[PDB]
Structure 1
Amino acid sequence: HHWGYGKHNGPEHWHKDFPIAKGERQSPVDIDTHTAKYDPSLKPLSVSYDQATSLRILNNGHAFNVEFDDSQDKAVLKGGPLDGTYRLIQFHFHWGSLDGQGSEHTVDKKKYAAELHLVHWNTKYGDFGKAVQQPDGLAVLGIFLKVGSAKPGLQKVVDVLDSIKTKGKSADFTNFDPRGLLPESLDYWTYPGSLTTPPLLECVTWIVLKEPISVSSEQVLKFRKLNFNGEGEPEELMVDNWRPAQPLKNRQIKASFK
């Protein structure tokens, strides 16, 4: 009886195996745009993905992960609210059964169709596993998806999903350029938070871009054809793999923009 997104193992159950689920810096949150304070001390985000080397895509039974070779100093996130340099290890999405839900962060209670997370670890802690034990171990770049025009840079991801339909399936996924998933503007909100799945560790500096990317109805429909279940198990469509907004508690959301 492992955690997942269902009635019997979903977010409202996670606290039993992961008591930090009710902690002081849990993610995601609602971003109240009127209460978020412009912080002129925040720096422009530095997103340097020119040398990003993707290796593989994996269906882990919760989402699909596009994994990167993080063995060298290549794909790095720095500046914005961050001290030092954070290395890209993977990206994944959260999405809905319908276009009206799927994002984890909300903006004045608005839910987007999906949310992209680019996960980076603080190079001062030497690897991903050690970084998640630290309050400044990870920087996750969150990007909203709305349904409209296709995102051409997403299509290589969409086209490989047929080959990883079920939990435990992986596929070679080399030479994927994550710059094709970024919106024009790097205006952002930032706050201290957590992983949004178990183990829910409070190790994340969240950086959530204000500008969504547009993806087509056809692109997101192909996300919704994936399966939570393994090959030769009863079909459970991989939809609604999002955690709802959690209490903000003693936290300030800061805006990079006026």
Structure 2
Amino acid sequence: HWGYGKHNGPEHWHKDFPIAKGERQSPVDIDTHTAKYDPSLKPLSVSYDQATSLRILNNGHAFNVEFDDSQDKAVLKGGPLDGTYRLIQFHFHWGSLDGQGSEHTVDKKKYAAELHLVHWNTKYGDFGKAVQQPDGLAVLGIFLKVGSAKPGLQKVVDVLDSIKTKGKSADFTNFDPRGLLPESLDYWTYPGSLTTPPLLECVTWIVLKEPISVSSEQVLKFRKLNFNGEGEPEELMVDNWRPAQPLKNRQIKASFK
């Protein structure tokens, strides 16, 4: 099925998922000199104190840290959003080398990786019905650069040895996603899509301007994961990023002057 190799990578995905060539695909390049400050934006509220992580899963494309979304426990509100969006999972995209790995770019700059915290609009009752809606989802996107270690990431790095291959999962309780956030919540926002199949056009993207720094050793451990299942030839899980897609008839708005 789909992946990130020569034969099944992002340029192929449109054959099984025609929305790949849609009007509101993600990611995009964020041209900082075309994005405009929007005074109509309310302050962004990241309310993660009651977050309940459950498990971490290698799905043969990335790894997901999954949360209990059965109540309003870890929510995103404010900014461009109308109402309350509940955190369901996060995951990353990364490169084989530090010069690439992000999906959004900033003035064509690629970061070493990118974190996506996925949330769904509680007015639609659950995630499945949220992805039938143009405002069903909000993804908080955070760039990673290589520099100092991120201590709030090390519990993730240390569990990766136990979910090396596709279909492996591990308990992952009591993980605090606050430890993944940069100091500033300045952001760009635009209407887009999920960046993996099914590529659904439901997402209000909120992409933080300030990257987090992780260490070379941390990112190196991401690169030891496998796309393949146990007992299959090793294909290292690297370069699991979709490139920038056409902006089409969209505007990117900045939360800051």
TM range (shorter): over 0.9
Q: Deviation per CA, 1:80-124: give whole Å up to 9, x if none.
A: 000000000000000000000000000000000000000000000
Shift in Å at residue 26 of structure 1? 0.1
Shift in Å at residue 12 of structure 1? 0.2
Q: Does structure 2 conserve the Cα–Cα contact (< 8 Å) formed by 1:125 and 1:131?
A: yes
**Distance in 2 between the 1:44 and 1:64 partners?**
30
Q: Does structure 2 conserve the Cα–Cα contact (< 8 Å) formed by 1:24 and 1:249?
A: yes
1:156 counterpart SS class: helix
Q: Does structure 2 conserve the Cα–Cα contact (< 8 Å) formed by 1:104 and 1:243?
A: yes
Runs of 4+ in 1 over 4 A off after TM superposition: none
**Distance in 2 between the 1:212 and 1:132 partners?**
28
**Distance in 1 between the 2:215 and 2:146 partners?**
5
Which residue number in structure 2 is paired with residue 203 of structure 1? 202
**Distance in 1 between the 2:208 and 2:8 partners?**
30
Q: Does structure 2 conserve the Cα–Cα contact (< 8 Å) formed by 1:58 and 1:168?
A: yes
Q: Deviation per CA, 1:68-87: give whole Å up to 9, x if none.
A: 00011110000000000000
**Distance in 2 between the 1:52 and 1:135 partners?**
26
Structure 1-normalised TM-score?
0.99
**Distance in 1 between the 2:56 and 2:241 partners?**
19
**Distance in 2 between the 1:219 and 1:59 partners?**
17
Q: Deviation per CA, 1:30-75: give whole Å up to 9, x if none.
A: 0000000000111121000000000000000000000000011110
**Distance in 1 between the 2:57 and 2:203 partners?**
23
Shift in Å at residue 203 of structure 1? 0.4
Q: Deviation per CA, 1:190-231: give whole Å up to 9, x if none.
A: 000000000000000000000000000000000000000000
**Distance in 2 between the 1:145 and 1:43 partners?**
26
Q: Deviation per CA, 1:11-40: give whole Å up to 9, x if none.
A: 000000000000000000000000000001
Structure 2-normalised TM-score?
1.00
**Superposed CA RMSD:** 0.3
Unaligned stretches of 5+ residues in structure 1: none
Unaligned stretches of 5+ residues in structure 2: none
**Distance in 1 between the 2:179 and 2:154 partners?**
10
Shift in Å at residue 150 of structure 1? 0.3
2:118 counterpart SS class: strand
**Distance in 2 between the 1:193 and 1:73 partners?**
24
2:173 counterpart SS class: coil
**Distance in 2 between the 1:148 and 1:97 partners?**
16
Q: Does structure 2 conserve the Cα–Cα contact (< 8 Å) formed by 1:38 and 1:257?
A: yes
2:26 counterpart SS class: coil
2:210 counterpart SS class: coil
2:64 counterpart SS class: strand
**Distance in 2 between the 1:62 and 1:193 partners?**
20
Q: Deviation per CA, 1:149-206: give whole Å up to 9, x if none.
A: 0000000000000000000000000000000000000000000000000000000000
**Distance in 2 between the 1:254 and 1:207 partners?**
10
**Distance in 2 between the 1:72 and 1:85 partners?**
11
Listed as ranges, the matches of 1:106-185 within 5 Å are 106-185=105-184
Listed as ranges, the matches of 1:218-237 within 5 Å are 218-237=217-236
Shift in Å at residue 3 of structure 1? 0.3
Q: Does structure 2 conserve the Cα–Cα contact (< 8 Å) formed by 1:81 and 1:190?
A: yes
1:180 counterpart SS class: helix
Q: Percent identity among equivalent residues?
A: 100
Q: Deviation per CA, 1:229-249: give whole Å up to 9, x if none.
A: 000000000000000000000
**Distance in 1 between the 2:70 and 2:94 partners?**
30
Q: Does structure 2 conserve the Cα–Cα contact (< 8 Å) formed by 1:44 and 1:186?
A: no
